[PDB]
């Protein structure tokens, strides 16, 4: 026995403990990340950490124990549903004689003790990329491989840690109260009417459909159930059935608690309305607020993201999981308006990017606007929640509010409520599409329920600094804050984003922000993108292959998208920003959709979806990534065909299972991705003429620049409409005045004969009584005080 293939001889100690200590490291494959043990994973350690860092911990409040009530007694409008056996005959409500302190313990995965399939990097793809690189002469191949391996080695998809969540809360407090403490719109210098005039341009809205119910009813009254499928309708917002119910139902989904949410939402709105018109509105309103304190406390859910391994315990984004009744009531105000307001820069003369999709010509419409602005030597601004985009001095600037939500004051949300109730919930005659009860909830209570309220982590009831990220108004409040920053930029004579004059806008507004991207020589970059467009492959000559040499991309990072010029379509098309593309390839999310995960059909289809989606979003233009992902999806498809396993239904309706499912609803993945798929996703319904875009619904002819100029002159301090004047006065008057405020609104709300004249007289009357400083107190402060009572 001579020349036998060597086998590793090791000590019995090594053998016993299965040690790889001696073994040669395969630098081609990164080791799995194992999160450290978390020292802040106990209520004692977490509370001490927060105390040491001067973070406010509230005196804990208790929720009454659950009591069973008859569904038909609690929800009389749904008696028929109970009778038809379609709805449970009992509801579990917090009306007990005893009470409990709520506890929320979220799961953080992976963790020190569990490094499993959740958050696993795509090592199979890494191996496929490696092998395809050996077999193919792709000039961009080595860089693609390096990038995917580096993302696997440095990032981690998962739900962070308690330390990450706690450190994140500190960062939010610092944004809100630290270097640049928050400022209410009034402190900055804006009245609710002045802000509404800016929002008419930055966030154009339409009124809800005339057939949509006004804000006059208890939520359950918007449910019409008879049994007749043709007439059965809910006029309420839609909900994510598998999402958390929030307080007072920890561990339950919205699906398990819809009847309970309706009972609680009905009760809160009913009690509030009665209290407001009672003999003592202050005592009654404060009692209702205290009784339903839990409707203002969000479960501090750790957000799943592709975090950096080194900053695993330094930063974990949180989702402020709003109580289902609060969510329902807030959504009743925002959704009917927003559903009718998908107005953005591609379809309306507005800087708004609300409802934007880069697909179906969207990216090309943006590129046309960018090119025209560059040609006409004009500045350009675009706004999307906490994202600001500025085109000035042949440069594309991406400005993001620093931890956006943390900059929010209840007054910012109150101004948004004013905008929605004046511009949205209004009839053609100027009369309100709401009653005093709804104006009370919307204007006086709602902003202090989700802004500067509280959250729950473990058994700790913690202060929330700013607005709760994930609440129904997150986008709207963030968009209003960006509007203030942009308005201040215009006022300051449009200082370049790289200057101190631009950075000084942080103090002027009390809103923290940072320049995230500076894309220099824009005009030249766009020219290069067109010139370098390949003649070969997908969207070039139409063949089902990636280009040998991909063209230059205009790296706008416009809501995560870059632009590529297509010779076949003679237009710019979106491709997911490189860094996001690589991170999604390295750390794919799993089947993260309800019970869907238990459906073998969905689980199986997902494995194909996962690779098809990575190709669709931009992988198609990365020769190595397209080659490997195509191979993998085809292999999976072939196994199914050979085995006779049908998942076509899940492949057709794939959108629900992919982080990329948005907008791409009309595309099907039952057939493999081809050049047609790419043509289809990029096909516009209509040709584009920027000059043909309709102007904003309100103040059409006016631009944001014109409105800013008017505001600096002291214009729009007060609305002309008496109905609107009453709503602005509502923001200044203390809760004890609610019964009298209800009387001032009743004529316009009831649309009585001569309501307009009556309202004018009542508004002037109210205006006079507001000369008494004793009557002047923010109901938002009164709400917070009542919510925090023990
Ligand atoms: K701030």
Author numbering: 3 to 792
Which lines from the publication concern this structure?
Members of the family Birnaviridae possess bi-segmented double-stranded RNA (dsRNA) genomes and form virions with non-enveloped single-shelled icosahedral capsids. From sequence analysis it was proposed that the RdRPs of Birnaviridae possess a non-canonical active site where the polymerase sequence motifs are re-ordered C-A-B, motif C containing ADN in place of the conserved GDD catalytic residues. An additional unusual feature of birnavirus RdRPs is their ability to self-guanylylate: auto-catalyzing the covalent addition of a GMP moiety to a serine residue of the polymerase in a template-independent manner to form VP1pG. We have cloned, expressed and solved the structure of the RdRP VP1 from IPNV in both its apo form and bound to a catalytic metal (magnesium).
Clear electron density connects the helix with residue 31 of an adjacent molecule in the crystal in 7 of the 8 molecules present in the asymmetric unit. In addition, residues 3–10 are seen in this structure extending toward the catalytic active site. As in the high-resolution structures, the helix formed by residues 13–19 lies in a hydrophobic pocket within the active site cleft formed by loops of the fingers domain and the N-terminal extension. Residues 11–12 form a short isolated β strand which interacts with residue 241 of the fingers domain, while residue 10 spans the two sides of the active site cleft. Residues 7–10 interact with a loop between residues 594–598 of the thumb, this loop being partly mobile and modeled as having two conformations in the refined structure. Residues 3–6 interact with the thumb, the palm and the C-terminal extension, the side chain of F5 being buried in a hydrophobic pocket between the side chains of residues W563, L578, R582 and F662. While the conformation of S2 (the first residue of mature VP1 assuming removal of the initiator methionine by methionine aminopeptidase) could not be assigned unambiguously, it will clearly lie extremely close to the catalytic residues of the active site. The observed self-interaction brings the N-terminal residue of VP1 (S2, assuming removal of the initiator methionine) within approximately 5 Å of the catalytic site, and removal of the N-terminal tail or mutation of S2 to alanine abolishes the ability of VP1 to form covalent RNA∶polymerase complexes. Instead, we propose that residue S2 at the N-terminus of VP1 represents the site of covalent attachment of RNA product to the polymerase.
